[PDB]
Write a protein that binds this ligand. Structure first.
Ligand SMILES: N=C(N)c1cc(-c2ccccc2)c(-c2cnc[nH]2)s1
Ligand SMILES: N=C(N)c1cc(-c2ccccc2)c(-c2cnc[nH]2)s1
Ligand SMILES: N=C(N)c1cc(-c2ccccc2)c(-c2cnc[nH]2)s1
Ligand SMILES: N=C(N)c1cc(-c2ccccc2)c(-c2cnc[nH]2)s1
Ligand SMILES: [Ca+2]
Ligand SMILES: [Ca+2]
Ligand SMILES: [Mg+2]
Ligand SMILES: [Mg+2]
Ligand SMILES: [Mg+2]
Ligand SMILES: [Mg+2]
Lengths: 12, 227, 227, 12
């Protein structure tokens, strides 16, 4: 999936 | 729980060690133990709690998407069973975090910086449940409700460059885009948030400026993908 | 154990899914369940078992070194306690793997490709115990004993380009260098292994050539650091 | 620590 930009560690 | 016998200060020190060691499951268990001491958390401690669980649920979400894709392509019970195993473990981490927020972090959080931070987290962990839900409407409304309460407080009590306010708006805009199927609301929120921050940057020191522009760049990155 | 009720074929399929999902603890538990079915493992299944546990113990070793460094710099009990917690979990993974090799993978392994693979693994997991040991002499000798038996069989039964033979020699050379404090033995073994492989490459297809040269490049990388 | 080059996943 294209994941959008959420706040904090990009851990996924 | 298992951390009941360890000093609060020892749990926080070991959370910071676990972070250095990239031991995020340990980091989360140490911070859960610190929260269960019943004292309010400092700004640093709230960030330790958030980073720990974000790393844990991030592993689970990434795994779930890999397995869901295989499952969708495959349409034996094994792919479904294993996707269901990961999904249940993810739901349990979300339920654990929502448990800490409701017992009793939110109710004792009176300052805007604590209360918005915890209500953003409550929105984020309902959003993670919504990502795997297929009750889905009620989970989405729980996420929306938490985000909206955090937004109302942030707009009254925090400057538009406040990094907590910015991260909240970023995450609420992504909620609108891909959970609530409201791409126009997502774009509007991201643009208004970016523009109001831009106009407040003049007030900031070099260090606050760097913290605010980093999150504003994530809003721009999304707007570039969405428009 | 917990995997007693799942089909062997289902455990192997879920190990491969867990690998795709980067869920290495799950992958290891599925492969432990497959081994405990009591049948010998195929070449693919042996590699699944090895990759799963290598990823798990690799996380633990990396964490242990971070914590040991902090502990050495610090010379409160917290750093020692947390390093000891990670060390015990690492020892338990090594004891679990050595348990599978001794019950009963090694004793039923008659072909050179299976028997060398499992004796190399036994050497590797004793080496990981030796890395944290401070009985240390007896653990080092257990590692040496396993590696030497694997080497004797590999030299009699496998061509010098055989990737299992090459990986064995690579790992035994690193055992000599930094566990046995025998840097000259490490260099001699790495050079002889590289040179004998080089002279057998002519016999190989394009696909076998690529598999052998990849491990020969790791021998060269070490020799470059050691000389 | 400088880790040397062992066979398989470089997981540490
Ligand atoms: N990963 C971590 N240990 C931290 C992240 C942040 C943070 C980072 C950026 C912005 C706000 C907080 C911490 C912190 C807060 N107040 C003192 N430090 S600690
Ligand atoms: N800890 C919490 N407050 C909740 C967890 C879950 C849940 C959701 C999915 C799976 C397991 C638990 C909630 C819920 C709301 N609607 C339906 N389920 S509320
Ligand atoms: N990570 C994995 N699933 C694998 C690694 C290897 C392997 C890779 C390189 C060399 C030898 C084996 C596998 C395999 C063996 N025989 C069929 N496949 S499966
Ligand atoms: N499963 C196995 N065969 C072993 C595990 C350990 C061990 C080593 C360290 C910690 C826990 C277990 C062994 C051992 C050999 N000398 C002393 N301890 S033998
Ligand atoms: Ca399963
Ligand atoms: Ca501990
Ligand atoms: Mg992400
Ligand atoms: Mg208070
Ligand atoms: Mg046999
Ligand atoms: Mg390594």
């Amino acid at each position: 999936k294209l994941m959008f930009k959420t706040e904090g560690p990009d851990s996924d | 729980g298992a951390m009941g016998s360890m000093e609060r200060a020892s749990l926080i020190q070991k959370a910071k060690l676990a972070e250095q060691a990239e031991r995020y499951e340990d980091m989360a268990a140490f911070m859960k133990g610190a929260v269960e001491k019943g004292e309010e958390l400092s700004c640093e401690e709230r960030n330790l709690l958030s980073v720990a669980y974000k790393n844990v649920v991030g592993g689970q979400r990434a795994a779930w998407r890999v397995l869901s894709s295989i499952e969708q392509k495959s349409n034996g019970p094994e792919v479904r069973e294993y996707r269901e195993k990961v999904e249940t473990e993810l739901q349990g981490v979300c339920d654990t975090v929502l448990g800490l927020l409701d017992s009793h972090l939110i109710k004792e959080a009176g300052d805007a910086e604590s209360r918005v931070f915890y209500l953003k987290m409550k929105g984020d962990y309902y959003r993670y449940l919504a990502e795997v839900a297929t009750d889905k409407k009620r989970i989405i409304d729980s996420a929306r409700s938490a985000y909206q309460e955090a937004m109302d407080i942030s707009k009254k009590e925090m400057p538009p460059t406040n990094p907590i306010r910015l991260g909240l708006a970023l995450n609420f805009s992504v909620f609108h885009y891909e959970i609530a199927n409201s791409p126009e609301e997502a774009i509007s929120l991201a643009k208004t948030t970016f523009d109001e921050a831009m106009a407040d940057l003049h007030t900031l020191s070099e260090d606050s400026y760097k913290d605010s522009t980093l999150i504003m760049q994530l809003l721009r990155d999304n707007l570039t993908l969405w428009t």
